[PDB]
Design a protein around this ligand. Structure first.
Ligand SMILES: O=C(O)CCC(=O)C(=O)O
Ligand SMILES: [Fe+2]
Length: 253
C-alpha cells in the first residue's frame, strides 16, 4: 500500500494525506505508517479534528506500547517549554522509540517544533569522524538517573546509524571536559545544521509522530503568553545497540 506522502524538507519530514487516525486503522495502513516513519523520521497528519484523548491513545497502541494523565486516559500527557535540542528521556537505558503528539490549542503565531535527522547527521560526517563517533560513549543525565549510551546507535529496524546526543548529554566518557565539549559541539552541530531539520507550524488537529531513535527536536519558545496545548502519547523503546553490538547501561539510581 502506498500512502499519499508529501516530503516537507529535503532530508526529513513528511506529510501524510487521506488518513484519518483512529484505533481502527487496518494492518496495511499501520504498516505503511510505520515504514513512512522509519524513512522520514517525523510524519505529519493534518485535520485530525475527530481524534480525541481516548482515540489518540487507541491509535497509539497500534504502533507500540504506551509508557498525572489527561482524564480519563491511562497514558495521555498534556503539555502547556522544551526549547533545547534533545532526544526524549535519553538519561534512561530504554528510552522511548516514538511519540504521538497532537495540537489541541495552537498559537496564531509562533509555537513551532523543529526535528533534526540524526541518521543524516551521522552519514554526512567525513569518514574518519564517523569512525571516531563509532567509538565514543556519552553519559546522559537528568540532573536522578545517569546512563551511558554509545554516541552512535544502530537502529533496530532500519540498521541506519544515528547520533545519540542532545541536551541530556553530560560528557563524552574518557575525555577531559574541554575535549568533551569540542567533540560534542562538532557532532551535535551536524545534528542541528539547518539542512538536517524540518520545522512544523502547528494548527489545531495536527498530529506529529517522530522516531525518537533517529531524531532530536526543539520546541520554539517565541509565542509569549499565547496558549499552547498539546497532548502526547509516548511509546516504549529498546535498549540502544552500538556499532560493535554493545548495549547502553544505567550507572546511577
Ligand atoms: O512541545 C513540543 O512541541 C515538543 C515537546 C517535547 O519535546 C516532547 O513532547 O517530547
Ligand atoms: Fe521532547
Amino acid at each position: 500500500l502506498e500512502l499519499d506522502v508529501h516530503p516537507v524538507a529535503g532530508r526529513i519530514g513528511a506529510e501524510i494525506r487521506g488518513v484519518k487516525l483512529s484505533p481502527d486503522l487496518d494492518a496495511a495502513t499501520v504498516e505503511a505508517i510505520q515504514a513512512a516513519l522509519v524513512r522520514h523520521k517525523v510524519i505529519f497528519f493534518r485535520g485530525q479534528t475527530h481524534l480525541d484523548d481516548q482515540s489518540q491513545e487507541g491509535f497509539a497502541k497500534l504502533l507500540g506500547e504506551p509508557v498525572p494523565v489527561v482524564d480519563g486516559t491511562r497514558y495521555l500527557l498534556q503539555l502547556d517549554r522544551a526549547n533545547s535540542w534533545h532526544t526524549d528521556v535519553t538519561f534512561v537505558e530504554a528510552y522511548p522509540k516514538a511519540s504521538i503528539l497532537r495540537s489541541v490549542v495552537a498559537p496564531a503565531s509562533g509555537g513551532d517544533t523543529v526535528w533534526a535527522n540524526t541518521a543524516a547527521a551521522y552519514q554526512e560526517l567525513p569518514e574518519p569522524l564517523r569512525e571516531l563517533a563509532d567509538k565514543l560513549w556519552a553519559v546522559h543525565s537528568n540532573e536522578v538517573y545517569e546512563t551511558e549510551h554509545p554516541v552512535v546507535r544502530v537502529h533496530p529496524i532500519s540498521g541506519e546509524r544515528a547520533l545519540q546526543l542532545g541536551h541530556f548529554v553530560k560528557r563524552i566518557k574518557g575525555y577531559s571536559l574541554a575535549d568533551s565539549q569540542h567533540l560534542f559541539a562538532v557532532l551535535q552541530g551536524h545534528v542541528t545544521r539547518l539542512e538536517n531539520t524540518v520545522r512544523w507550524r502547528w494548527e489545531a488537529g495536527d498530529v506529529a509522530i517522530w522516531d525518537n531513535r533517529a531524531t532530536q527536536h526543539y520546541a520554539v519558545d517565541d509565542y509569549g503568553t499565547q496558549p499552547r496545548i498539546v497532548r502526547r502519547v509516548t511509546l516504549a523503546g529498546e535498549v540502544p545497540v552500538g556499532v560493535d553490538g554493545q548495549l547502553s547501561r544505567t550507572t546511577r539510581k
